[PDB]
C-alpha cells in the first residue's frame, strides 16, 4: 500500500528560476503527511501560452509573432544541464518519486516533454509527446517511438500520457501490454468531458489513473485520482489550488483483473494484432573512427 | 438530418413465438411518430438467462443444469429460417431500418449475434459476439474475424458491438477504419460506468452512440443517445420503460473531427500499425466436384 | 525542342464545378497557339483559404470554426471519382501534358496534392504534400516517401514539388538522383525572394524550373521560367493574370551538366551518403484468403 | 550584438612577403571603427593564377608549363610554420577573429584552404576544399571528410565553405546540423547568379551570410553580408576595392526559425536520412613503439 499526491498550482509563465522554487516548497510541503509519489501539470517549469494567437492568418507572418516566439524560446530548459541537477538533487534530500512535465529545447526547437525521477537523484528518463493537438503544432515538435517508457519501481510500474496523447487508442495498448499498474496523465483541460474519459481508461486497464491539471488567473482546472474498479478516491477540485492525496491499494488490481483483462485473456490473438516500431531516428548521423 | 429510436422493452423469456408480437405491438408505436431506424436489446428474442447459475460447481454438473440448459436450448431461431421472414416482412410493410438482437442455434451450439434489415425487407448480414464475458463461455460460443460489418445505407454507415465488445481497443479502431458514423450498441448492464464509457466512445470516434437496454422485473436498464460532441440529447431513461428518440444532425460529423480526426491525421503510421486477419475459418470441410 | 505554358489564373473558391470550365476556356487559348505541357497554380480546384484564421487561440475551439471548417471540407474532389474522368478527357481531345493543383478528400481529411496526365488521357500518378508549412498543418495533412514520381516521358522527365518543399536540401537531392529535367513547381507566395531561391534550383540542378502562381483580389503572383544557365526566358508577370511560355531547348542541359554536375562527378560518395525510405505506410490492413 | 567585416582587396600575386603586410595593415584599418571579426578572401596569400592555361592539350605537355608550375609552387606557405605565427601574432594584438584563405603545400602538392584564429593568437583549425572545380583539379588537391570544423567562440558560431562548395545540398546539410550561425563563403566568382545564389542559403539556414570576393586589375567582385531574413544589410560593392562594414543582431535568428526549421521540425527523419563518413584517411601510415 503506497500512497500518492497531485498538486494543482500554477506557474509564473516567465523568469523560470523564480517557478523553480515553488515546486521547492510544495515539495516539502507535500513531504510532511508521508507521501511517496508526487506529480506535476503540463508545462510546469515552461509555461504554456493560453490564450496567445501569435497573430498566424494564412502566411501573413507578421512582426508581432517572432517577438513573442522569441520571448517565449528564451524561457525553456534543456536536459540534461543546470535545471535537471537541481530537481535531482530535490527529490534526493528525502525519498519521494518526481514526475514533473517541463519544457526542454534542442537547438531552435521545443518539445513538451516528462522527466522520471528516483527517491535516490538518479534521472530515470524522459518522453517527448507524440502529436501536439492543434494550435501547438506551430510551436512544438513531433516524438517518436523511441521514447515511451516502462520504469519499474519497487512501488510499482509507473509511466505517462499527455494532454490528448490518451484518446489514442493504439498507443494504450501499447502501455498495457508493458505492465502499466500507476497510468500518470498531465492535461490542460477542464471539461466534463475528461472526467468521464479517464473513467474509461481505468476500467479498460486495470491500473490507479492520477491526473493533475493546473489552476490559473482560463481553466479551473480539476484532477483527481481513480480505483480501478471505476471509483473516485479523491474529486475534481474545481475551487482554488490545493494538494490531493489518497492511498493506493496495489492488490485492488489482481481482483479487477477477474472479469476483465486486455492483452491477456481478452484481445483474441487470432484475429488481431499490433506491432510497434521502436527506432531512434535522427536527420543526420555523424560516424568517426 | 435523420432521427431514430431506441427501446427499451422486456422478453417473455421463454415461448418465443409469444415475444415476436411485441417486436410489432411496439414497433408501430415507435414508427408512428415518424421514425426511420429502430435499434432493440441485447437478447431480446431468445432471452438473456439472469440468475441462474445452472449448479456448477468446478465439474460437479449435477441434474439440475443439463434440463435447465436444453429447456434454454429449445428456445432459440435458426438462420435463415420462418423466423427471419418475419421480420422481413414486418421491415418490408412500412420503412424503417431495422436491427435486432437475437440468439441462434447452429447445431446444438449458441451463439449470441444481431441481424441487420433495411427498408425494402433485405437481409443485409450479422455479427457474431467475438468474446463472451465471464459464465457466458460456459454457454454461448466464440466468433472469428469474418463477421464484422459495416453496410453503407443511404442513411449513413451503421455497425455494432455487443457488451463488453465496447473495451476492446483493437476491435473498436477496426470498426472506425471503415467509417462508422452510427454506432449502435445494445447491452445487458447498467451501472453508472457504462454511461461514462459511452460517452468516450462518442470523443474518440466521431459517431452517434445510440445504445439499447432492456427493463424488467433487476435490469435498471439506462439508454441513451449521445452527439460526437459529448453531449447527452435523450437521457438515460432509468425510470420504466418507454420509446427514446432523437434528431441525428450528419453534418455535425465533418465538424467534429476538425480537431480529432483517428487514423489519419492524428494516428502516426510511421509507428504504429495494426492488422487484421478476415478468414472464414471452420473445422470440417467438404468438397466434391 | 518543345515549349511549354503556365498560367496564372485565379479559382471561384466555392462551387467547385463552376471552376472547372475555367481550366477548360483558358486551357484552350494556351492551347491554340501550339502548346505542349501546361502546368496549373497550387490548389486550383479546391481553393486556398486566404486571411481565414478559423478561431484558433490555442485550443479554445469557438463555434465559428467548425462552420468554415466544413464549409471548406465540403469543396474537395477525391481520386478516383467523376472530377479526374472530366480532366482525362479534357487532356485527351487535342494532344497536351496536363499537370494541375488539386486538393483531395479521404474520409475527413485533407491533402492537399497534384495530378499528372499524359496525351492519351491516361492517368499517371499523384504527388502528395510531405509537409504543410504554419497554420497549413491544422486542416491539411502529412505525406509518406511512397509518393515521389519522375514519370519517364517522350518529351523527357517530368517531377514536382509544392510551396516550401522546395528548401529541403535532401528531397531535392532525391529527386535529382533520378534525372529530372523538367522541374514544375507550382506554388502560393509572391515575394521578391522567390525567385532568387528558384534560380539556385535551376543553377544547381540542370533542370528548367517552370513554376506557376495564382492572381486573384493578396496573390500578386509572379510565375517565370528559368533556363539552366540561371537565364529567365519569360519573365516575372506581375501585372494581372495571363498565359506565359517560352521553348525548352533539352540540348541545353548536357552542356549544363559540363561544369557542375550533382551526384557524379561532383558528389562525394566516400564522404556523404543518402537514404530514402519509401515505404507505404497506412494505420490499418485487412487480409483475407 | 557583434559586428563584421569582409574586404575587397586583391593579392600582388610573387613575393608573400610583400603581401603579408597588406594584411596588417588594412587589420589595423579595420580595428579603428571597433569591428570585431574580419573576413578575408579566397587565396589571398598564394594567389589565384587568372587567365593562365599551363599550355594543356591532352597530354602534350609542353616545357612552356613546367616552369610556371614550378614559380607558382614556389609561392605557397605551410602550415604550421615561419607564416602562421606571424598572423597569430597579428590577430593577437587585440581583439579580433581572423578567417583567412592560404594556399598550403604538403611535399609537391597544394590544397586550397582557409585557417580560423582566435582573440588570443591560438590557432583553431583547417579545412581544405573538398572539389575544386574546372581546370583547378590539375593544380590543387582534394579534401576529405574528416576536416569541416564546427568553432564555437563567445560571439556565436563560425564556419566556412569556398567557391563551389556552396552548391552541394549534402555539405551545407551537414553544417546545418551542428549549429552554424555564422556563415562564412569566399569565392573567386562575380556574376549576378552568385548574389542571388547566397540569398538561398541565408533563407534555407537561419545563418547570416558573409562573403568576400577580391578586385583586381579581371573579375571585379562584389562582396556582401545578409540577414537570415534575405535583406542585405551591405551591398554587393563592384566600384574599387574597400573595407564593408555591418553589424549582426544574434537575436534575428530565434524569430527566422519559427516559419520554418530545417534538421529540426522539417526534414522527415522518417523517410530521409543522410551520414557522414568523418575518418582522417592517408596514405602511408608508420607506427612505432
Same mark, same amino acid.
Given at each position: 500500500?503506497?500512497?500518492?499526491?497531485?498538486?494543482?498550482?500554477?506557474?509564473?509563465?516567465?523568469?523560470?528560476?523564480?517557478?523553480?522554487?515553488?515546486?521547492?516548497?510544495?515539495?516539502?510541503?507535500?513531504?510532511?503527511?508521508?507521501?511517496?509519489?508526487?506529480?506535476?501539470?503540463?508545462?510546469?517549469?515552461?509555461?504554456?501560452?493560453?490564450?496567445?494567437?501569435?497573430? %498566424?492568418?494564412?502566411?501573413?507572418?507578421?512582426?508581432?509573432?517572432?517577438?513573442?516566439?522569441?520571448?517565449?524560446?528564451?524561457?525553456?530548459?534543456?536536459?540534461?544541464?543546470?535545471?535537471?541537477?537541481?530537481?535531482? %538533487?530535490?527529490?534526493?534530500?528525502?525519498?519521494?518519486?518526481?514526475?514533473?512535465?517541463?519544457?526542454?529545447?534542442?537547438?531552435?526547437?521545443?518539445?513538451?516533454?516528462?522527466?522520471?525521477?528516483? *527517491?535516490?537523484?538518479?534521472?530515470?528518463?524522459?518522453?517527448?509527446?507524440?502529436?501536439?493537438?492543434?494550435?501547438?503544432?506551430?510551436?512544438?515538435?513531433?516524438?517518436?517511438?523511441?521514447?515511451?517508457?516502462?520504469?519499474?519501481?519497487?512501488?510499482?510500474?509507473?509511466?505517462?500520457?499527455?494532454?490528448?496523447?490518451?484518446?489514442?487508442?493504439?498507443?494504450?495498448?501499447?502501455?498495457?501490454?508493458?505492465?502499466?499498474?500507476?497510468?500518470?496523465?498531465?492535461?490542460?483541460?477542464?471539461?466534463?468531458?475528461?472526467?468521464?474519459?479517464?473513467?474509461?481508461?481505468?476500467?479498460?486497464?486495470?491500473?490507479?489513473?492520477? *491526473?493533475?491539471?493546473?489552476?490559473?488567473?482560463?481553466?479551473?482546472?480539476?484532477?483527481?485520482?481513480?480505483?480501478? %474498479?471505476?471509483?473516485?478516491?479523491?474529486?475534481?477540485?474545481?475551487?482554488?489550488?490545493?494538494?490531493?492525496?489518497?492511498?493506493?491499494?496495489?492488490?485492488?488490481?489482481?481482483?479487477?483483473?477477474?472479469?476483465?483483462?486486455?492483452?491477456?485473456?481478452?484481445?483474441?490473438?487470432?484475429?488481431?494484432? %499490433?506491432?510497434?516500431?521502436?527506432?531512434?531516428?535522427?536527420?543526420?548521423?555523424?560516424?568517426?573512427?
Amino acid at each position: 500500500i503506497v500512497r500518492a499526491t497531485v498538486v494543482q498550482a500554477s506557474t509564473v509563465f516567465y523568469d523560470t528560476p523564480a517557478t523553480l522554487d515553488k515546486a521547492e516548497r510544495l515539495l516539502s510541503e507535500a513531504a510532511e503527511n508521508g507521501s511517496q509519489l508526487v506529480v506535476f501539470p503540463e508545462a510546469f517549469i515552461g509555461g504554456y501560452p493560453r490564450g496567445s494567437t501569435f497573430e %498566424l492568418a494564412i502566411g501573413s507572418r507578421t512582426a508581432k509573432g517572432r517577438d513573442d516566439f522569441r520571448k517565449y524560446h528564451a524561457s525553456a530548459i534543456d536536459v540534461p544541464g543546470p535545471e535537471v541537477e537541481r530537481l535531482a %538533487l530535490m527529490a534526493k534530500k528525502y525519498k519521494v518519486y518526481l514526475v514533473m512535465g517541463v519544457i526542454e529545447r534542442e537547438g531552435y526547437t521545443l518539445y513538451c516533454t516528462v522527466l522520471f525521477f528516483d *527517491s535516490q537523484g538518479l534521472f530515470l528518463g524522459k518522453h517527448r509527446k507524440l502529436m501536439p493537438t492543434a494550435l501547438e503544432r506551430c510551436i512544438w515538435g513531433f516524438g517518436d517511438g523511441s521514447t515511451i517508457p516502462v520504469f519499474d519501481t519497487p512501488i510499482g510500474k509507473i509511466g505517462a500520457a499527455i494532454c490528448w496523447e490518451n484518446r489514442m487508442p493504439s498507443l494504450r495498448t501499447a502501455m498495457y501490454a508493458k505492465g502499466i499498474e500507476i497510468y500518470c496523465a498531465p492535461t490542460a483541460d477542464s471539461r466534463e468531458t475528461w472526467l468521464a474519459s479517464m473513467t474509461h481508461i481505468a476500467l479498460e486497464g486495470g491500473c490507479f489513473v492520477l *491526473s493533475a491539471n493546473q489552476f490559473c488567473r482560463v481553466c479551473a482546472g480539476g484532477s483527481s485520482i481513480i480505483s480501478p %474498479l471505476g471509483i473516485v478516491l479523491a474529486g475534481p477540485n474545481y475551487r482554488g489550488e490545493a494538494l490531493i492525496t489518497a492511498d493506493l491499494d496495489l492488490g485492488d488490481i489482481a481482483r479487477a483483473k477477474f472479469d476483465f483483462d486486455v492483452v491477456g485473456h481478452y484481445s483474441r490473438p487470432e484475429v488481431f494484432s %499490433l506491432n510497434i516500431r521502436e527506432h531512434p531516428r535522427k536527420a543526420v548521423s555523424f560516424k568517426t573512427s
